């Protein structure tokens, strides 16, 4: 997260870290046994870490649960990142509490201007790279359709939306992958892609979760 701020220990209970001997992506807890992330965050043997703040230090409130299966959307396009969503089922149900809680899926898409909360342990610099210990936050508004399409000419599909600041300086970055974009208590987006990080006219492009609610429900139910 570029230009964000320390969220504060477990102030984003639904935020999770995908681990492969190291943090490589973010994720959102949607129920005691399922996590929503980006399809580009796929890999075998992922270990989900819940209740994390300082990913470099075991603080005592974490729950490490191996993913029993990571299901990428059937229509995921690796080149464009169209349909960049993935469901991860936990080998076992997480113990939900004040530091480990799920986020509600949307029942309708968010309007331009809707301010959201984006979080993650990604790269904190727009040039080069520096990773934080604790979870970083960022309040960013959803960008209008036209401004989104102008920034990424012909690269924005209906399963994507922009959010951030066109003047740059504040944005998500590599490491935030799969992380949440919560607006009014609803997970409306997933950290997907973008041109650089925090560049002017190059805001974060996020997976439009509202478009995948039926798929998510259908996948969770038959798994």
Curated annotation (Swiss-Prot):
This protein's UniProt keywords: Calcium, Digestion, Disulfide bond, Hydrolase, Metal-binding, Protease, Secreted, Serine protease, Signal, Zymogen
Cofactor(s) it depends on: Ca(2+)
Peptidase S1 domain: residues covered: 1-221
PTM section of the record: Subsequent cleavage after Lys-125 leads to alpha-trypsin. Further cleavage after Lys-170 yields pseudotrypsin. A cleavage may also occur after Arg-99.
Coarse class of the protein's main subcellular location: secreted
This enzyme's EC code(s): 3.4.21.4
Bridged cysteine pairs (disulfide): 7-137, 25-41, 109-210, 116-183, 148-162, 173-197
Annotated positions binding substrate: 171-172, 174-175, 177
Catalytic residues in the record: 40 (charge relay system), 84 (charge relay system), 177 (charge relay system)
GO cellular component labels: extracellular space; serine protease inhibitor complex
Enzymatic class: hydrolase
Activity regulation text: Is inhibited by scorpion cyclotide trypsin inhibitor TopI1.
Residues binding Ca(2+), per UniProt: 52, 54, 57, 62
Quaternary state and interactors: Interacts with SERPINA1.
Protein family membership: Belongs to the peptidase S1 family.
Identification of the protein by name: Serine protease 1
Organism, scientific name: Bos taurus (Bovine)
Name of the gene encoding the protein in the UniProt record: PRSS1
